[PDB]
Subunit: 490 residues, 3 copies
């Protein structure tokens, strides 16, 4: 029987909503089909973007989206995705086509339709200072200039706003195989020539470490911390070796425990990378951003390996659940977190196949957990039961936020697929007595997933296996189950 | 009573004329109105440049002018200021208009009208190697090429000459927030691709330290001394803290002493920066240049802070006087010095308001002192009276040059606004007996200045309060007074 | 009497053919006249390239050619040498013309006519990442893109293949006066954006040391070894000081010994540079390339110093002979070597004067030695007689390759101009008895050369001064003589 306590009055901090962010690259079918269908697609589309999806994502409360991020960011020359759609640059190989029908206007249009924040990676590695400089002009400049006038010519009269501007991505690997010390001075130079136009205020973001490249972090903070509002981190949960990762479904119990363990490791990274930052930034001015996190499996049997099409099982849901719980645990420093990717690519929330689209297990977590977005984080501590092959992992993940409305939400994940988790919770700092509802996402299968033929195999059922004897909330979480509660006073 | 001795025969060195250089940025109204009025201005203009000013500056013996220098240099893409004036690139914002009507041809035309030397900062931070490379082609290339032919097309048949080519400016701050070690390798790279065309001979100039960034100097000398003819230094006399500098007029006696003291500090910099260079350059091949010096006050009450419009009091005159006296004291290493700025910006020599223009106190100093330009510096030493709140500052600054004509000029500044300075001078290395005239610039007010309503409040009166009894020249400088003498033998 | 032994069965390794490579820069008349005459030249030309030469070079078995290499590589913007020949960029000085009639298509056409491999230096120093990136697209990309389609538009339908891609040249001197540590990160960045298109496989080459800049080598291996397939080395045999090198003909016996000794030094370099690489690359993955080697003399009396027109004496032939023998001695690590230059420039194989062209002493060596190209290197060791003013140099250079056909070739150079070299050779690992022919290149004069008036003063005479008594081959090389043999079994 796992035990928890909650101090409903002691606010530990606030869970910045952008933590529930997402990330889309010109890759597989994340941009094309997944979102951009073109205005005269048979699919129900708003201005070229498919409705079925837009609905879901507004319903999911997306706060922010990264584009074009990843490696494409340090290849994209933004001028190839503006102007008349019929004179935009075009590239094709058969071994994979980019028409750049989706470029700058279209992205901004999208972010406004959802209502989310735009987050953009300018091209460092192959790009130029003045290139990226002008991208910012083109977008946010109110006055008269070649670039601003070109924006107008292209159909957008008044300039857009944007906060988050990533200066390159992955500059250690595909972004220019740069040494840390080197990328520092480039960032310093580039960022110098990005202006706050009109009253638009930038939030510059340096490309940070990959995994446990603490060196990278160290250097960046010493050389460049003054010139940045934030710093990126990349960590992927891969089950197996690189060359043989394992599948998204039809995996062994071994692979279960692995994936979970390897995802948890996150916390170790964030912490160690935080301690580095805490030194060079005592006052924790600088954002920690995690613009690249998620599971990663061998693509589905048959699909193009580079199209990264992978399924999304109850495993993948669990993964998300504790991850967010981790970002909660480090919400003092962390302020944004973008899953890889959004659609038809890696741990996607949505997967499509023509006009048919489904929500994954993962999607339901983001929808369920959304109530934690900008909610006040509450002091707790636990006596979590052990689980796994050697009391390896903790049986239960648990978080507690108070939203503006006063109502309080508690999220929980049974890691043990094999049996339900006994939990008792004691609840302190109360005025009124309280009522309590519940929602559980869970599966019969360890690799229970939604197909286009069965889109609702795994989805939120409301949950009632819990007694609330005003002070002790006892409950029995089902196996392999994410679960949320909502409590009102009186 | 302050005492001096002069060894008229021992020449300490020669005061390179370029020390009396100036500096104009596309900023406020330094370029526009201040100089460029357009050929079709009602103002009396020669080919777009106002006469009233040109007269004054030829009268002032300008040796060299820096353009577009400052921060604009590391933003200017020179191709935006050539070609047909009506198709040159254009920007406007009200938060400031640049039509680039003033570009490359116009500047060179100007430098030739005055008769001065041109000094240009190419764009490092936002620019490209090939960009700056071609700027040099466009200008100095005699043969047939895209760039040379484009010069011709644009109206200038034969190529211009130019010596001084600054590789960027202020690359530590606005020019690309570069570390010193970094900017070194960039300079090395860029400068590699700047050629001596026809017989035009370049004089390459690396961007040096800001104030007491001795690190910057050290690094640059070790890494790049081989590849440079000269090295830049920036020092601004600011009265107060950065955020609250103080006004140009209507200031306290506190602010008087401050400004003077802070200006003197210069000598400490030059000396320490010299000793660095003396190590890495025993034979003092490399020029020290000071392309950014002057007072700096909060702009006048009402003007745009970024238009940097500041007045020009007798304080500002004194400032210049000892500064030049300092460059004299270090003329062995120093070879050029450019005041910030020329017109309608900071410690300007000239300020305009439509067709009306006035000469500042500062202007008179440069006009008065001009006789030191390329004159032979003479050995002296002094017993200068103390002044200021704690015998802080020396009462009297003093310098002595022999011009080509054999005649000898002595410049002096009473720092004490409160009383005149007694001075006696003994005079050695003489054959013939000598005569002597004199000129004094001085004010009744501590913040005596010229307005457009009173353009002649502060200006050179000839001066006769001195007895020259063949061996001893005794004299009584007025309070807050710059003063020059001219002496012929026989 | 010099003694040698040969183990015909023990293969020491294989002499990569590319070792017999050459190198042509847009310089003097190496590209223009020397090769490119224009389709409408009176000279016998194939599609603009002179026949007389082409014939010779196919006859000489050229394996690979470097272009545009040298300093022009880090100035060439490749887009200035594609498109319609009549709209290609044009530059002229009168002190000397580049019309860029020779650009990318023409080079590839050339390499295919000869049948050789193309080796290209992209522009680092003045160029851009995306520039060089696109050059690779333009050439090797099979699909649809602006650059690939532009290739097609220009007349070449399908994309070329190319292996060897030099990332800049001479980045320590004319290529951007870079520090080693700096050029490393640039290479790393640039090379990131050069792709294997279709199935074209690149063989990237970093610019290495000049002479004995072991620092450069060290650094490059530590910083960048992972990102390179090969590394360049530059060594020039200059007789005298820089400012007075000496002439190519009419030189003293002093100058003889000098030039030889200084050329030999090569071996010391290769060895020491090898030992560096052997550390950072035990498995000798990384190629050593020597893209810049040759004699260098003051140009002929009257020609433009920068046109680098220099003659080619029996001295120059000797030089080549031992050099190749050295690359043989280090063929385990060395895989390519390009003489400077090909035509009308430095130690050229061919020199022209209108339609008249001659083959130099050097040419004959490459033609004679060609039989070593991709032949299997044989174990030997010697007791070489001493020569020179202090038993300075070894009298005899000697190498031994077995070509595919089974036949075995032995190359030899008498360094002593003054007397013939007695040699005995013992021969091991034999099955059949053997027969033997021979060819000697030699001169009566120390500075014997071919003029246009006497094109055949110095050329391959077959050679028979050797007795082969089945086991011992005794022979008397003539003075200042390169010599080859070919032996069949039975």
């Amino acid at each position: 029987a796992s035990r928890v306590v909650v101090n409903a009055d002691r606010v530990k901090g606030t869970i910045n909503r952008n933590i529930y962010g997402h990330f889309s690259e010109h890759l597989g079918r994340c941009i094309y089909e997944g979102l951009w269908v073109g205005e005269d697609s048979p699919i129900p589309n708003t201005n070229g973007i498919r409705n079925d999806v837009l609905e879901a994502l507004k319903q999911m409360k997306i706060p922010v989206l990264h584009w074009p991020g990843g490696c494409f960011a340090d290849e994209y020359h933004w001028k190839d995705g503006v102007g008349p759609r019929e004179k935009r640059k075009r590239m094709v190989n058969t071994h994979v086509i980019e028409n750049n029908h989706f470029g700058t206007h279209e992205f901004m249009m999208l972010c406004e339709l959802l209502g989310c924040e735009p987050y953009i990676s300018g091209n460092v590695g192959s790009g130029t200072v003045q290139e990226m400089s002008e991208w910012v002009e083109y977008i946010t400049f109110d006055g008269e200039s070649p670039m601003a006038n070109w924006r107008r010519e292209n159909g957008r009269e008044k300039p857009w706003r944007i906060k988050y501007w990533g200066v390159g991505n992955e500059n250690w690997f595909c972004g220019g195989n740069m040494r840390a010390e080197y990328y520092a001075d480039l960032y310093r130079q580039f960022q110098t020539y990005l202006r706050n136009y009109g009253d638009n205020k930038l939030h510059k973001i340096a490309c940070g470490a990959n995994t446990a490249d603490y060196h990278w972090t160290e250097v960046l903070m010493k050389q460049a911390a003054p010139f940045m509002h934030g710093l990126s981190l990349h960590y992927y949960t891969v089950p197996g070796p690189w060359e043989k990762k394992g599948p998204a479904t039809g995996f062994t119990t071994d692979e279960w425990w692995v994936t979970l363990k390897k995802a948890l490791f996150m916390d170790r990274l964030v912490t160690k990378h935080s301690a580095i930052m805490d030194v060079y930034d005592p006052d924790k001015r600088i954002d920690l951003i995690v613009d690249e996190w998620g599971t990663w499996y061998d693509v589905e049997p048959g699909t193009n390996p580079g199209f990264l099409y992978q399924q999304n099982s109850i495993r993948d849901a669990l993964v998300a659940g504790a991850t967010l719980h981790i970002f909660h645990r480090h919400c003092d420093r962390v302020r944004m977190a973008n899953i890889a990717q959004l659609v038809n690519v890696m741990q996607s929330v949505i997967l499509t196949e023509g006009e048919r689209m489904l929500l994954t297990p993962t999607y339901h977590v983001f929808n369920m957990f959304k109530v934690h977005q900008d909610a006040e984080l509450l002091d707790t501590w636990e006596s979590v039961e052990r689980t796994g092959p050697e009391g390896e992992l903790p049986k239960v993940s648990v978080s507690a936020s108070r939203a503006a409305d006063g109502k309080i939400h508690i999220s929980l994940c049974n890691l043990d697929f094999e049996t339900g988790a006994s939990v008792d919770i004691e609840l302190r700092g109360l005025n009124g007595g309280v009522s309590a509802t519940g929602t559980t996402l869970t599966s019969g299968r360890i690799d229970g997933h939604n197909t286009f033929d069965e889109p609702e195999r795994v989805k939120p059922a409301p949950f009632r296996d819990f007694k609330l004897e005003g002070g002790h909330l006892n409950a029995s979480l089902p196996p392999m189950s994410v679960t949320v509660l909502e409590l009102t006073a009186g």
